[model samples]
Target: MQLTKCEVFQKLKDLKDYGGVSLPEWVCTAFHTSGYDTQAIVQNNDSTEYGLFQINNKIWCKDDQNPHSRNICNISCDKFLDDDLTDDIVCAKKILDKVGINYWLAHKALCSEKLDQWLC
Candidate 1:
């Protein structure tokens, strides 16, 4: 599901202070990382990145494809590749709590500056 900026904001606005990142920054990171694509999947050499926030299977979720996976989120990676973003948001918050926003290089490359464009 490709979501508009307003849709993303509406979904994320209630997460105030959830990830130690501002709401606008979260919206910015979403676009830069997944282009607001709820089911976006990107394969890496060892693991796959999934969903709206692009949580990876290596440590965040289980795909049963990555042998090194720790499955910290305690959820199936397949859940991320769906229109419902509830699981993705929960997993993303876990990632953010441990690694911070720089977990997505896009946050540093694009979202850190001029985040207003991602806002409603």
Candidate 2:
């Protein structure tokens, strides 16, 4: 529902702690950058983003029952929306491993300036 995931992200800080950079708020930035909706699903052009991270279908996750994907995060986009988020965090960690926060455009343009809103 396009909410802030600060409360939920805190519970999964292990995904951020995997790298240890900037601050804890960096993770929150991601939570804000992506949709907080557990059922969030958005499409822009040929790609669709899923769940809290809005993980891209063009690259990270697969659909169409093909059992494959184009880019990183080998899990299915379906997995990101289940609301459990264990798989979501696991997939996100892989994204951070390669691109850092740059992978999320929302963090750069939206969340970077007002990190406090995400923090408290």
Candidate 3:
């Protein structure tokens, strides 16, 4: 599912302070990473990233081909592609708590210094 910028911002507000990251930072990271497209899936060198937050299979999720998958979130990678973002939000918070916001290089490169634009 594709979401507008404001829609994405609104939804991620549920994450406010949930992971030591602010709502704008979450919205910004979601924007640059997947353009708020829930179906977005990217193939990395060794792992595939899934959904709005681009949670990867190397450690956070599992894929059939990746034997090294840790499945830390204990979910199927396909779940991230759906419109229901409940699981996505839970997993994203886990990521932020464990890996920090640096996991999304897009946020560091583009959104970090300009977070105000994403908020009211």
Candidate 4:
């Protein structure tokens, strides 16, 4: 399925709402420019941590093996579809909590923007 930019924006908005963090437009732009489609990146299955934030299964699995656990693909899928805003936000925060925002920033810098900061 080909999701449009509006859909991606909505997803980002939902994620922002859940996490209580206003994702800067530049971040979205960087994500796209980095060749990551929101839906595609958000629903990655290549690994446990293949989503938008690359949330690995081992990290989540370490805690438990429930719907919220990383090993359970269904849990991630369910959370993604919930569109609860808060759920998505919490997921984003969890990713940050596990990896740190700087890791994402560095990942984006090295892989996407190829710059150290967000440039207009």
Candidate 5:
């Protein structure tokens, strides 16, 4: 299924609201670097680490128990409707918090100048 530009933009806006970042140029760069079809993956599961963002599952699962880990994957689009932007931002921050900005910077350094597109 194809998303209209408006839809994509709205989704990006929601992600920005949730992730606490402006439109990420690094998302595109990371997509190219990781060789993943960004849109397809996110469309499949915005909650999953499957996009230009590559938002890993662990970020969302860190606070949950092992058996409950699978349940975290069940978080759906409806959850976003609750205006729980904090969880989303926290999860996004967790990614950087766990990996550290320097590590991501170093990884990007191996790629192209598009790596400079990121913001904390």
Candidate 6:
């Protein structure tokens, strides 16, 4: 199920990343907005990015909407929308491990600045 922005805020705060590193709040905030996790697909870009983390079908996943995808995660795109964020977090780690945080365009543009608003 989709989560509220505040729900995401707290979720990120309480969850432990399997990525084996600590992340500050603004980074979580960037992902929350980037994926628009609480929102539905705002548009269809020929191929859809799936789930709460918005991992895309163009390269990292395969969906019926775009079957000829690389599916780097080796899981179905539909699985991304589950109420559990385990896979979401794990797959996101893959992106992070492969490309670092800049893989998320939102992080570069909007994640940090004040660094206080959501930290608490």
lDDT of 3 by residue, 1-120 (tens): 899888888777789878567788788888888999999999967779999999999999887867568888998899999998889999988888788888886346566677788885
TM-score of each: 0.89, 0.73, 0.89, 0.44, 0.36, 0.71
Residues 1-120 of candidate 5 have per-residue lDDT tens digits of 233333333444444433333345334334343342333333233334433333444433422223244434344322332323344334445555555433234554443455344432
Where in model 2 is the C-alpha error above 4 Å? 1-6, 65-68, 106-117
In model 3, which runs have C-alpha deviations exceeding 4 angstroms? 106-109
Which regions in candidate 4 have their CA more than 4 angstroms from the true location? Answer: 17-21, 25-47, 61-88, 107-120
Q: Global CA lDDT of candidate 4, please? A: 0.42
Candidate 1 residue lDDT tens string, 1-120:
899989999887656568567888888888888999998999978779988888888788888787558989998888988888877888788888899888886337576677677779
Local accuracy of candidate 2 as per-residue lDDT tens digits, 21-76: 44445555455555466677778766788887777877788976434567477677
Clashing pairs in 6: none
Per-model clash counts, in order, read 0, 1, 0, 6, 1, 0
lDDT of each: 0.82, 0.66, 0.85, 0.42, 0.39, 0.61
Q: Assess candidate 2 and give its lDDT.
A: 0.66
Model 2 residue 1 CA deviation in Å: 8.3
The candidate that wins on lDDT is: 3
- 114: Cα error in model 2, Å: 5.9
Tens digit of lDDT per residue, candidate 4, span 1-120? 233444545555644433333445434542543333333333243333333444444443222333344443224533433323345345556665555455356444343334323222
Q: Ranking under lDDT, best-scoring first?
A: 3, 1, 2, 6, 4, 5
Q: Stretches of candidate 5 above 4 Å error? A: 1-25, 33-48, 62-67, 70-90, 101-106, 110-120
What tens digits encode model 6's per-residue C-alpha lDDT throughout 77-117? 87776666667676777877887656665455355555455
Q: Which of the two candidates, 1 or 4, achieves a greater TM-score against the reference?
A: 1
- RMSD of candidate 6 to the truth, in angstroms, is 3.3
Give the range where candidate 4 is weakest over 10 consecutive residues by summed lDDT.
Answer: 111-120
